[PDB]
Amino acid sequence: VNIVDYSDCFEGISGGAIFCNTKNKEYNIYNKELIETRRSPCSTFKIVSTLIGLEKGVINSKESVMGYDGTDYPNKNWNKNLSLEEAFKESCVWYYKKLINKVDAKSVQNILDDLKYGNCDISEWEGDLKNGKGHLNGFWLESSLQISPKEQVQTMAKIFEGDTNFKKEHINILRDIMAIDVNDANINVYGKTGTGFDEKNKRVDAWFVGMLEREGDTYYFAIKSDDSNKEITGPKVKEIAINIIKKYYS
């Protein structure tokens, strides 16, 4: 466990990072207090909800659709019968809400328990209704479910090292749709952004969680900001993540 200083890559934004290589057991932690603090996963939960949907047969491949019903949304790309791959990359809330509402709560509880997914608290199934957004809400979006960046990395490692009961076929679908282009062919990077605002504490929950493959070595990582500046989003934290990978993990 090495405490490290990635602050140069954060360009003044408050946050932390954790990278874990489970082969040579090298934990690199920037801002240990924050890395151990549970927060809403926001859309990083789509990593797990995709696997839940595949395991339960709600979806079956990266092409699978969820029966778009014509509802009007301000994001162009939500207004179509999008595939799993596109809904994951667009972070399309209606697709994933419809997916998860086909699954019984006990099945989800037991999967989260098996994964040790933070507090595993799905008690507020419908989510943070006081924000007025109605059905565009759920337990994973600034609501009851909370997970620390360290626990995110431990969950990622368990899934992608093959240490869960999820089918290998389903793990590979997730790897496919998580792959990101970083303009460096010598590393493979996979991940998912998440964006929320913690109204109680007036801080963002801005996430990028995933893994890095570089010549035999694999690092599982979680980058997280808790800045008070509302402009700090998941996509901004992903930029920070990519700069850390290029500086320190090349």
Coordinates of C-alpha atoms in Angstrom, one line a residue:
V1 CA 0.0 0.0 0.0
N2 CA 1.7 3.1 -1.3
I3 CA 0.4 6.6 -0.6
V4 CA 1.0 8.7 -3.7
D5 CA 0.5 12.3 -4.8
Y6 CA -1.5 12.6 -8.0
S7 CA -2.6 16.1 -7.2
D8 CA -0.7 17.6 -10.2
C9 CA -3.2 15.7 -12.5
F10 CA -6.2 17.0 -10.6
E11 CA -5.5 20.6 -11.6
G12 CA -6.9 22.0 -8.4
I13 CA -10.0 19.8 -8.2
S14 CA -10.6 18.1 -4.9
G15 CA -10.6 14.3 -5.2
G16 CA -8.7 11.0 -4.8
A17 CA -7.6 8.0 -6.8
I18 CA -6.8 4.4 -6.1
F19 CA -5.1 1.9 -8.4
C20 CA -4.7 -1.8 -7.5
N21 CA -2.6 -4.5 -9.2
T22 CA -3.8 -7.8 -7.7
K23 CA -0.9 -9.8 -9.1
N24 CA 1.9 -8.0 -7.3
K25 CA -0.5 -6.6 -4.8
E26 CA 0.5 -3.0 -5.3
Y27 CA -2.2 -0.6 -3.9
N28 CA -1.5 3.1 -4.9
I29 CA -3.7 5.5 -3.0
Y30 CA -4.0 9.3 -3.4
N31 CA -6.1 10.9 -0.6
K32 CA -6.8 7.8 1.5
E33 CA -9.6 9.4 3.6
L34 CA -11.6 10.1 0.5
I35 CA -10.8 6.7 -1.1
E36 CA -12.3 5.0 2.0
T37 CA -15.5 7.2 2.0
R38 CA -18.8 5.7 0.7
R39 CA -20.8 7.8 -1.7
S40 CA -23.5 7.2 -4.3
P41 CA -22.1 5.3 -7.3
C42 CA -24.4 7.2 -9.7
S43 CA -24.1 5.9 -13.2
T44 CA -21.0 3.8 -12.4
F45 CA -23.6 1.4 -11.1
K46 CA -24.4 0.6 -14.8
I47 CA -21.3 -1.7 -14.7
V48 CA -23.2 -3.9 -12.2
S49 CA -26.7 -3.4 -13.5
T50 CA -25.6 -4.6 -16.9
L51 CA -24.4 -7.8 -15.4
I52 CA -27.6 -8.2 -13.4
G53 CA -29.6 -7.8 -16.5
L54 CA -27.6 -10.3 -18.5
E55 CA -27.6 -12.9 -15.6
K56 CA -31.4 -12.6 -15.4
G57 CA -32.0 -12.7 -19.1
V58 CA -33.6 -9.2 -19.3
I59 CA -30.8 -8.6 -21.9
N60 CA -28.6 -11.1 -23.7
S61 CA -26.0 -9.3 -25.9
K62 CA -24.5 -5.9 -26.7
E63 CA -27.3 -5.6 -29.3
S64 CA -30.1 -6.1 -26.8
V65 CA -33.0 -3.6 -26.8
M66 CA -35.4 -2.6 -24.1
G67 CA -38.5 -1.7 -26.1
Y68 CA -38.4 2.1 -26.5
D69 CA -41.9 3.5 -26.2
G70 CA -41.6 6.9 -27.9
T71 CA -41.2 9.1 -24.8
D72 CA -39.6 12.5 -25.6
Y73 CA -36.2 13.2 -24.0
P74 CA -33.8 16.2 -24.5
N75 CA -30.9 13.9 -25.4
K76 CA -31.3 13.0 -29.1
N77 CA -29.8 9.6 -28.6
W78 CA -32.2 8.6 -25.9
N79 CA -35.1 8.9 -28.3
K80 CA -34.6 5.5 -30.0
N81 CA -34.6 1.8 -29.5
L82 CA -31.0 1.8 -28.5
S83 CA -28.9 -1.3 -28.0
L84 CA -27.1 -2.2 -24.7
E85 CA -23.8 -0.9 -26.1
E86 CA -25.3 2.4 -27.0
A87 CA -27.3 2.8 -23.8
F88 CA -24.2 2.1 -21.7
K89 CA -22.1 4.7 -23.6
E90 CA -24.9 7.3 -23.6
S91 CA -25.6 6.5 -19.9
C92 CA -29.3 6.3 -20.9
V93 CA -31.3 6.4 -17.7
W94 CA -34.6 5.1 -19.1
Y95 CA -33.1 2.0 -20.5
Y96 CA -31.4 1.0 -17.3
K97 CA -34.4 2.0 -15.1
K98 CA -36.6 -0.2 -17.2
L99 CA -34.0 -3.0 -17.1
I100 CA -33.6 -3.0 -13.3
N101 CA -37.4 -2.7 -12.7
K102 CA -37.7 -6.1 -14.4
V103 CA -35.6 -7.7 -11.6
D104 CA -37.0 -8.6 -8.2
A105 CA -35.5 -6.8 -5.2
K106 CA -34.3 -10.0 -3.5
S107 CA -32.2 -11.0 -6.5
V108 CA -30.6 -7.6 -6.6
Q109 CA -30.0 -7.6 -2.8
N110 CA -28.3 -11.0 -3.0
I111 CA -26.1 -10.0 -6.0
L112 CA -24.9 -6.8 -4.2
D113 CA -24.3 -8.8 -1.0
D114 CA -22.2 -11.3 -3.0
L115 CA -20.2 -8.5 -4.7
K116 CA -19.8 -6.7 -1.3
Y117 CA -21.1 -3.6 -3.1
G118 CA -20.7 -1.0 -0.4
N119 CA -23.6 -0.7 2.0
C120 CA -25.7 -2.9 -0.3
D121 CA -28.7 -0.6 0.6
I122 CA -31.5 -0.8 -1.9
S123 CA -34.1 0.3 0.6
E124 CA -34.9 3.5 -1.5
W125 CA -35.6 1.5 -4.7
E126 CA -37.3 4.5 -6.4
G127 CA -34.4 6.8 -5.6
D128 CA -34.2 10.4 -4.6
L129 CA -37.8 11.5 -5.5
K130 CA -37.4 14.8 -3.7
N131 CA -35.4 16.1 -6.7
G132 CA -38.6 16.1 -8.8
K133 CA -37.3 13.8 -11.6
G134 CA -39.8 11.1 -10.9
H135 CA -39.0 7.8 -12.8
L136 CA -35.6 9.2 -13.8
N137 CA -34.3 8.1 -10.4
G138 CA -33.2 5.0 -8.6
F139 CA -31.4 3.6 -5.5
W140 CA -28.1 4.0 -7.2
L141 CA -28.5 7.8 -8.0
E142 CA -27.8 10.0 -4.9
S143 CA -30.0 7.7 -2.9
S144 CA -29.6 4.8 -0.5
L145 CA -26.8 2.8 -2.1
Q146 CA -23.3 3.9 -1.3
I147 CA -19.9 2.6 -2.1
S148 CA -16.3 3.8 -1.5
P149 CA -13.8 4.1 -4.3
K150 CA -11.8 1.4 -2.6
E151 CA -14.8 -0.9 -2.6
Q152 CA -15.4 -0.1 -6.3
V153 CA -11.9 -1.3 -7.1
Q154 CA -12.4 -4.5 -5.1
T155 CA -15.7 -5.1 -6.9
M156 CA -14.1 -4.5 -10.3
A157 CA -11.3 -6.9 -9.5
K158 CA -13.6 -9.6 -8.3
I159 CA -15.7 -9.4 -11.5
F160 CA -13.0 -9.1 -14.1
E161 CA -10.5 -11.6 -12.6
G162 CA -13.3 -14.2 -12.8
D163 CA -14.0 -14.5 -9.1
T164 CA -17.8 -14.2 -9.3
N165 CA -20.4 -16.6 -10.6
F166 CA -21.3 -14.2 -13.5
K167 CA -20.9 -16.0 -16.9
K168 CA -17.6 -15.3 -18.7
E169 CA -19.7 -14.5 -21.8
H170 CA -21.4 -11.7 -19.8
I171 CA -18.1 -10.4 -18.4
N172 CA -16.8 -10.1 -21.9
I173 CA -19.9 -8.2 -23.1
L174 CA -19.2 -5.7 -20.3
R175 CA -15.5 -5.5 -21.2
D176 CA -16.5 -4.8 -24.8
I177 CA -18.9 -1.9 -24.0
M178 CA -16.5 -0.4 -21.3
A179 CA -13.6 -0.1 -23.7
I180 CA -12.5 3.5 -24.2
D181 CA -10.2 5.1 -26.8
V182 CA -7.3 6.9 -25.1
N183 CA -5.2 7.5 -28.3
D184 CA -2.6 5.1 -26.9
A185 CA -2.5 1.6 -28.4
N186 CA -0.1 0.3 -25.8
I187 CA -2.6 0.3 -23.0
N188 CA -6.2 -0.9 -22.9
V189 CA -8.5 1.2 -20.7
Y190 CA -12.0 0.3 -19.7
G191 CA -14.4 2.3 -17.5
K192 CA -17.6 4.1 -16.8
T193 CA -18.3 7.7 -15.7
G194 CA -20.7 8.8 -13.1
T195 CA -22.2 12.2 -12.2
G196 CA -24.2 13.3 -9.3
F197 CA -24.6 16.1 -6.8
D198 CA -24.8 15.5 -3.0
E199 CA -27.4 18.1 -2.0
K200 CA -26.9 17.5 1.8
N201 CA -23.2 18.3 1.7
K202 CA -23.1 20.5 -1.4
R203 CA -20.5 18.4 -3.2
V204 CA -20.3 16.6 -6.5
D205 CA -20.0 12.9 -6.8
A206 CA -17.9 12.7 -10.0
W207 CA -16.5 9.3 -10.8
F208 CA -14.5 7.3 -13.3
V209 CA -14.2 3.6 -12.4
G210 CA -12.6 0.8 -14.4
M211 CA -9.4 -1.1 -15.3
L212 CA -6.2 -0.7 -17.2
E213 CA -4.3 -3.4 -19.1
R214 CA -0.6 -2.8 -19.9
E215 CA 1.7 -5.6 -21.0
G216 CA 0.5 -8.4 -18.7
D217 CA -0.2 -6.2 -15.8
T218 CA -3.8 -5.2 -14.9
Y219 CA -4.7 -2.3 -12.6
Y220 CA -8.2 -1.8 -11.2
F221 CA -8.9 1.9 -10.5
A222 CA -11.4 4.4 -9.2
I223 CA -11.0 8.2 -9.5
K224 CA -13.4 10.3 -7.6
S225 CA -14.0 14.0 -7.0
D226 CA -16.0 15.6 -4.1
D227 CA -15.4 19.2 -5.2
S228 CA -18.0 21.8 -4.3
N229 CA -17.8 23.1 -7.9
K230 CA -20.9 21.9 -9.7
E231 CA -19.1 22.0 -13.0
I232 CA -17.0 18.9 -12.0
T233 CA -18.7 15.9 -13.7
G234 CA -17.9 12.3 -14.5
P235 CA -16.5 13.2 -17.9
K236 CA -14.1 15.7 -16.3
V237 CA -12.9 13.1 -13.8
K238 CA -12.3 10.7 -16.7
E239 CA -10.0 13.3 -18.2
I240 CA -8.1 13.4 -14.9
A241 CA -8.0 9.6 -14.9
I242 CA -6.5 9.4 -18.3
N243 CA -3.8 12.0 -17.5
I244 CA -2.9 9.9 -14.4
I245 CA -2.7 6.7 -16.5
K246 CA -0.5 8.4 -19.1
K247 CA 1.8 10.0 -16.5
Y248 CA 2.2 7.2 -14.0
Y249 CA 1.0 3.9 -15.6
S250 CA 2.7 3.9 -19.0

